[PDB]
Design a protein around this nucleic acid. Structure first.
Length: 54
DNA sequence: GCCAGAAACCCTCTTTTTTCGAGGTCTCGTAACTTGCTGATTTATAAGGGTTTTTTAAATCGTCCGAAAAAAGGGTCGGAAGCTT
């Protein structure tokens, strides 16, 4: 597992998306993150993002 | 001859520094005021009832805006159905 995450969110949503992702990966751009992570970890990240999606 | 460093040249951004402009504000100079002379001619006016133009409100219309409602979409949970064992 070696992940790159990119965000295209808007307005209020992008504040939330930042709140989620920033806990799992260093921010390497205004809307991008990139780190290694375990497969189970990634699955949990996906679940958390889906839990509250505008 | 090789290698390194420093220096000269090119371009753009960032920040002060200077400059400029608008405009605001005050004060004094002065061309055109005001006050004073006469007498022939022109103009205004005391009241109030009937009569034109503009103001003013109301209504209407149109537009715009905002809010609410409805639609749309992202997703979760539980249940039922289908398939496989």
């Amino acid at each position: 597992m070696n992940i790159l995450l990119v965000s295209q969110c808007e307005k209020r949503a992008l504040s939330e998306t930042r709140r989620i992702l920033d806990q799992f990966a260093e921010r390497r751009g205004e809307r991008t993150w990139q780190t290694p992570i375990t497969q189970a970890g990634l699955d949990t990240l996906r679940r958390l993002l889906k839990k509250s999606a505008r």
